[PDB]
Ligand binder design. Sequence first.
Ligand SMILES: Cc1cc2nc3c(=O)[nH]c(=O)nc-3n(C[C@H](O)[C@H](O)[C@H](O)COP(=O)(O)OP(=O)(O)OC[C@H]3O[C@@H](n4cnc5c(N)ncnc54)[C@H](O)[C@@H]3O)c2cc1C
Ligand SMILES: Cc1cc2nc3c(=O)[nH]c(=O)nc-3n(C[C@H](O)[C@H](O)[C@H](O)COP(=O)(O)OP(=O)(O)OC[C@H]3O[C@@H](n4cnc5c(N)ncnc54)[C@H](O)[C@@H]3O)c2cc1C
Ligand code: SF4
Ligand code: SF4
Ligand code: SF4
Ligand code: SF4
Ligand code: SF4
Ligand code: SF4
Ligand code: SF4
Ligand code: SF4
Ligand SMILES: [Fe+3]
Lengths: 437, 252, 252, 291, 291
Amino acid sequence: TKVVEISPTTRLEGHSKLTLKVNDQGIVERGDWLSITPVRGIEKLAIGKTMEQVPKIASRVCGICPIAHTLASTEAMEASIGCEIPTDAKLLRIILHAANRIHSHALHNILILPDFYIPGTEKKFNLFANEQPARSVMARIVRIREIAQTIAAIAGGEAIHPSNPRIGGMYHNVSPRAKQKMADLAKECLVLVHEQMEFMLDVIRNMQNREFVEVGGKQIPLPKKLGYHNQGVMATAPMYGSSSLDDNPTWDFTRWKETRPWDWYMGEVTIDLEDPSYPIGGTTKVGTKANPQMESCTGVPTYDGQPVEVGPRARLATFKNFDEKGTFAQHIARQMEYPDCCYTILNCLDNLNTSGKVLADHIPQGDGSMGWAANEAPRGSNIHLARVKDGKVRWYDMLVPTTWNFPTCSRALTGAPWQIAEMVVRAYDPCVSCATH
Amino acid sequence: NKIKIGHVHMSGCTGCLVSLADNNLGLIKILDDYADLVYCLTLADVRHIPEMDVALVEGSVCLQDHESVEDIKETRKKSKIVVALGSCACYGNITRFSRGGQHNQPQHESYLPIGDLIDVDVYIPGCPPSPELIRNVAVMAYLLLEGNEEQKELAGKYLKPLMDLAKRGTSGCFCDLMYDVINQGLCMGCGTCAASCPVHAITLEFGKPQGERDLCIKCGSCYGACPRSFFNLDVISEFENISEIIAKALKD
Amino acid sequence: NKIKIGHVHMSGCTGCLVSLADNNLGLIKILDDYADLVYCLTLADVRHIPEMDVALVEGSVCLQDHESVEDIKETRKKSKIVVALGSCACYGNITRFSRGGQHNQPQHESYLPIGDLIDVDVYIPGCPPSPELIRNVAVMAYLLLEGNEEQKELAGKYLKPLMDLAKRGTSGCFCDLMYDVINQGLCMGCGTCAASCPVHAITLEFGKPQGERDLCIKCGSCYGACPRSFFNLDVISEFENISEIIAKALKD
Amino acid sequence: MIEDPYLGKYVTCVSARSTDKEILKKAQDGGIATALMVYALEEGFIDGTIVAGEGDKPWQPKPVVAMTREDILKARGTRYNISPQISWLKEATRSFGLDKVGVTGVCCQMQAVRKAQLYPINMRDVPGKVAFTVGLFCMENFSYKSLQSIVEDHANQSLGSVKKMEITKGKFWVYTERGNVATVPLKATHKYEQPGCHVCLDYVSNLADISTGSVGSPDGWSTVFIRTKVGNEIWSKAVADGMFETKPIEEVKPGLDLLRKLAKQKIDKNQKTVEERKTFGINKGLRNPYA
Amino acid sequence: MIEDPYLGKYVTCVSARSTDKEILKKAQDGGIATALMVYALEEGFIDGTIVAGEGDKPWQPKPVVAMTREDILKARGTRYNISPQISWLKEATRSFGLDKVGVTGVCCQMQAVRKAQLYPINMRDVPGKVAFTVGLFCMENFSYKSLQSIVEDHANQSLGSVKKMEITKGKFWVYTERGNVATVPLKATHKYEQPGCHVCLDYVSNLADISTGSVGSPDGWSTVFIRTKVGNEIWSKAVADGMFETKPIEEVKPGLDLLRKLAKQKIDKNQKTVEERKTFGINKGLRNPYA
Ligand SMILES: Cc1cc2nc3c(=O)[nH]c(=O)nc-3n(C[C@H](O)[C@H](O)[C@H](O)COP(=O)(O)OP(=O)(O)OC[C@H]3O[C@@H](n4cnc5c(N)ncnc54)[C@H](O)[C@@H]3O)c2cc1C
Ligand SMILES: Cc1cc2nc3c(=O)[nH]c(=O)nc-3n(C[C@H](O)[C@H](O)[C@H](O)COP(=O)(O)OP(=O)(O)OC[C@H]3O[C@@H](n4cnc5c(N)ncnc54)[C@H](O)[C@@H]3O)c2cc1C
Ligand code: SF4
Ligand code: SF4
Ligand code: SF4
Ligand code: SF4
Ligand code: SF4
Ligand code: SF4
Ligand code: SF4
Ligand code: SF4
Ligand SMILES: [Fe+3]
């Protein structure tokens, strides 16, 4: 056993590292992927603040998925106080949610493609480069994300940190013109995401037929079971979410418990294996001490006493019994989620009444009861829990998808050549600012 | 010659980077012709901070995180121009409210905008910051370093109010409109602050700003956008020409 | 020789004067032995601002009221030591919220603390300011101008943090505890800010301040009272001796 | 281009009034601001515009995004108190889903728009979606309590009866629906001006695409500056389409000579105020937004 | 008077413990802080005192104004997380109507009281109504989440079972009600310290009337500094009344030599931190409250 460390990780959101024990062949025996993002402490600073402010603060946990936290936080407040929002407010929230999932999955295409090969060649995608096919692909992705952000801005008030959601529904309904504009854009987007999806699935399928990849000049073998783990999955909806107001909620808070990294991470180790050629800048210096239990910045939520995988694959496994697992299965399931986003937007626009009410007539102030809301963020189940009393948050808790995925991905690192541990990581589409909040 | 640009991610949400990317083909145009992205953990595999002409720095600094403090000091050392990108970097924003006590780093208690630890050349305020502003600053930074004298003169005039904001301080709030506009005899009731506020904390009552201070997330946008904070007539009166210049620089 | 003291009433509520008077026989002792009240429209018939050793100035300045602006300029001209008495004079306080529009002077819109118009030597923050603080400042001002060198040295050391506050700025808010204490790594959870807040806007959650910003009336008390704003060990460690000195100066 | 130091940059200046007789019935002057926005909407230069609609109290304006000819016409007539027009500038591009926003307002509001186009600070999508701005001349404005005090006390009129107000020929004029007229000397109104107007160095909405006002033209007519390429395209095409009567401004009394003089008095007086701010205190001064 | 540079100003220093056997049953050490406040209340030196009462979560302190012997005794035992004692300092003189307030707490809380006596900033009536302060020795403190992490993870104990906690001999000690003992090396606890403690230059509550702690005295006994005239009057009279066993501190191991050394390490380490703040940045630093 030797210990190699990659710090920082790259082509994901935010700040983490991989602390890896490897065998004499460089295959991970036990690896820890951990947040080293400072804890801004949103759960504790929320206490005493107003139920209107806390969702707008929680939004600023993450600018890729602020819709997830805005909606999950707002709907946790609504669940605690017992506020039923109007239909047209819900329809606008779903449109906002679906649009953001498009932009997020497409942004993630940008981050993972450099690890992938132009099918049938030994050339990797370089999306910066003004050459084909990369530039044509970048142009499609860029238009996809532009459409997505535009719809999000129209239905949510703002693409990043949406302003329209409020306790009890929305500040604004949209105009007949705005509704036509969103429909026009969704029609254009649906064709584009079908193209991007088929493109990505082909690239992934080419990856599954490869035997090695090139990292830092060297050939790295591709295990058949790359990224396999035995944690199973958790998901609350295929699209939107669930909350404790529902007749039959699809998440069970009696099965959840959160520990410190303590229960699940390695203690102190010393780095004795270093590779200065790891692109670009090498790995952690020999002699460095690391302690994942103490350095990890997240809590570890569990379901039935164990870490779980959340995210697109978790959703398709839970709701369609999708039956492939590991790194390339995760990539596949994410791409498959493209069309539902556009069909959902178009169906929601069809049902939206632009003269309809968007704010509940009565917003109660709460008595301290616990409520919770789950939003199926692009990366998986985002669960916010709250006690609101007299309009103030007395208790707040956030179980964010990448928080769930950190210990699970770690276990999935077993069997990988340490030089492609980052590829295992990127199939989770990590958001480490999310994970840490 | 392309200038060298890095994106440095401190205690931010990456929404500032998303805002840059939301210039769409404008960003690709800039990366094609005017600028090399030498560093960005989100998009590229350069692991350590290299030399930069322009560092776009987002997020604030956790005083109790050693690597973070070293990163922001190293960034100033490595960069000709330091840009506080977005309100967290400029003004602390939601991290003003951080107070520790959360797992798994309950000692991660104190956060300051980057201007309290290093000297900052340029503020780009906003939460989220507007894509167009980030684009204008990138283009003008290039013109300031690779243009003819007529361009470098324009660029210097364009950036001056954003440099003045960096010298003014590291605090942003609804109160800026009281302290420095209404209380100064300068408010004329235009309502711009209300449009810019990302959380709808500002209403106008009889033509005057009314701030919901317990909704305000201290981003500094409203004073920035207010036309009685800075109003540099030499630049803004030439809006048609400066707009045409920026468009031409992005054209295909 | 008694020093000469005036009370100047700008846009204040006179509660600062009431606080002075609430030293009871202490005030009469001071007026008997150490100080002549040369000016105070509330208590005496001197119609115009005379020369003063110490001007206790309460309230802020309405920029659209000509006599008010002349009064505060005349006060600085007429006074050796200018004291911003209370939070309106120090920090604007509730007049930060003024925005015009009320009969019969709808143009009376803009109010600034006095330190934005003249140089201020000494802050006495608080709304209301504590009688004991106003007494201590009067006594120490006398010692600074009529004492032996040992007294003038003590007085100068006592007043230094109140002079530092005057040089720090003209703004007061719950946010001071964020910006300059919690965000600086200095908060240790003592809870003093909560006791000093006059409107109960501060609670402590898990040992850390939580501010109801839409209750806060921007008086600057909490940062003042915080033992991690200024803590001048040379003075405060001698609390027993300095207390005995002040008592003896008020004794009969 | 003319680069006048008091009237701003412009291509031409004419005296004009709308040929739409319905618009003229309630227009303040020539109906230029209504006629241009209606026409821009019908032609597709804008898909909506911010106008000073009717509010919750008599003669109090309420900004609104108008998207029909009818809603635009509801904003005819001068309201001499504050209308925070720019408060709907971003929202017009969000829930309203507009691609081509029009904006009407006074000089400082035109300034706000151009600052947002060039320095968007939490104003995403606004720079590229501003399509057409029409700026009113403005000497000064008032709070609503000021306007109440002027009309009810000094003019002795009930606000519920007022059909039109007009500042001209040294007086504040009040016209009632039943046909009476009252005047107030402007000297009496000065205490009531919004203080932030005293620092304003822009009289004829220098930064608008098209600027329009009353001074320089007879009653029923407007003085119009056509300034930007946007402004010239729309004006040319509207004139060609029969939307306006025009006269070159030099053939009109009092014309551009009176106008340039009042512009000069405004800037001169306010530049002085701007300067006195620097030494307002003892050893210190007040902020200058223009520094 | 002794003017020690690390132990502050004091008249004498003894090793002591209360003769009240009921108090000792749950006291952390010698029962000095409880015994003094109970005695001051019975004798009329105070009519109430601020103590670290029991809170809403196990081992979380809640400050409270205690006005009976029974309520004072509820605050026995060290809670190693933050108790914002000073938050009730003014209120004790308002709705509670006290004339003679007692205050218990650690060094920084003693500091807060004296600052309020000398620089009352919206602390009316407080300077004259503080009657008696008892200060605990304090090396450092923790947030509640820190304490949870230390006890539940590192010591592997349930908080609901803990009877006593103790930092001593290089370890964090946890004693359970059913009789078990667990320890954690203090090196493991350092990441969890409240950051604001790292700037604290006061170990034995220099500014209290009487200071009390554990280091220097055997188990069951306290090291006590009697510092002010208030402190000497109350201590003398309590000793004379039979309230305490004492031993001169020089006849006690480890005694004042160990104590002065730990005090020196604390100030030395924290003075260094205070100094590094000045150059924390590049060309700038962090605030120093002591400057
Ligand atoms: C405070 C104010 C001061 C003015 N001072 C002068 C002056 O000194 N000299 C001069 O020649 N003209 C001045 N004007 C302009 C003049 O009064 C007419 O408004 C202008 O000629 C437009 O008339 P019109 O027939 O073209 O517009 P109309 O067709 O009658 O349409 C009215 C237009 O004015 C806008 N509007 C009405 N009230 C306000 C308001 N409070 N704020 C913002 N927009 C408003 C509406 O949105 C609409 O665009 C002033 C206008 C205002 C609001
Ligand atoms: C964070 C903390 C750190 C300490 N570090 C040291 C040290 O390094 N060396 C040393 O010798 N002693 C230290 N002490 C003091 C020691 O642990 C005992 O508290 C002290 O000896 C008093 O014991 P006693 O028997 O006289 O009090 P008891 O009769 O048991 O009464 C307990 C007293 O302690 C107060 N108290 C209990 N917890 C807190 C709290 N969190 N905050 C404020 N007041 C509290 C109560 O109000 C009460 O006055 C520390 C105490 C605390 C709270
Ligand atoms: S300024 Fe706003 S969008 Fe930018 S890093 Fe901070 S929270 Fe994110
Ligand atoms: S944006 Fe307009 S309304 Fe708001 S403070 Fe500035 S001048 Fe006043
Ligand atoms: S009021 Fe709104 S725009 Fe102004 S600082 Fe607060 S959140 Fe930002
Ligand atoms: S500081 Fe408070 S008490 Fe003093 S004049 Fe102002 S409102 Fe009155
Ligand atoms: S008074 Fe005490 S609790 Fe309040 S900010 Fe200061 S150190 Fe923190
Ligand atoms: S929180 Fe309270 S003490 Fe602090 S400035 Fe506001 S009102 Fe004053
Ligand atoms: S005078 Fe200037 S600041 Fe006042 S309303 Fe008219 S255009 Fe605006
Ligand atoms: S070490 Fe100092 S600041 Fe920390 S709790 Fe103890 S006495 Fe207070
Ligand atoms: Fe969490």
